Structure of Trifunctional purine biosynthetic protein adenosine-3:
Amino acid sequence: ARVAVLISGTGSNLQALIDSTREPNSSAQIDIVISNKAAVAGLDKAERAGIPTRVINHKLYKNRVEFDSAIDLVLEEFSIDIVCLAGFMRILSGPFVQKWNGKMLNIHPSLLPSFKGSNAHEQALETGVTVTGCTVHFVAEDVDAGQIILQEAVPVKRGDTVATLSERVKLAEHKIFPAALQLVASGTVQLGENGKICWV
Ligand SMILES: Nc1nc2ccn(CCCCc3csc(C(=O)N[C@@H](CCC(=O)O)C(=O)O)c3F)c2c(=O)[nH]1
Ligand SMILES: NCC(=O)N[C@@H]1O[C@H](COP(=O)([O-])[O-])[C@@H](O)[C@H]1O
């Protein structure tokens, strides 16, 4: 499968995915890395891996849909089959999400449906769970309300902060995200006609 990876910052998930798709049995191929914010470290790990990078600036488009279309042009230019959101902090418009329905994966640092949204670790710590984790799911029009592919639980140690909790969750992210991509690229997992996760 031809894969695009959309980032916004560090790209430690991107790096984790790069490492796995370089493996001989990878069903996946990272053909383009797109970022909405220039001069972010994800663009380096990508360039350091010899992967084309493209910066599309959401702040330069009048419409959110004009902005998604900028991305789809590149997705079609690179003949992409699968889109991985790896730290991408822009909500996509309905038609774009509909177009890539069942072809777009996201990594979210909670055990969904818990702690939907942008400050999941903050939420988890205020609530006081002792177990959190991360989730790979399909992007649906309901933000973080798509079909789950993989999940890994991670412990909340006492005295944790966003800094430490998120350090620990990210190690799990770096496992289930490559795994999930491989599941979808290989066609082992798909989005069933009934709209639930379908194993094959
Ligand atoms: N339909 C659908 N679309 C998309 C697009 C990306 N995702 C995955 C979740 C991304 C993480 C995320 C969760 S909330 C939020 C946010 O507040 N975004 C602000 C911009 C803030 C900023 O510019 O820093 C905004 O764009 O208004 C996020 F960025 C989805 C999805 O799951 N579903
Ligand atoms: N609400 C969405 C969200 O916060 N997603 C989070 O962004 C990070 C990407 O890190 P990276 O840039 O090092 O791959 C991840 O920690 C992921 O859980």
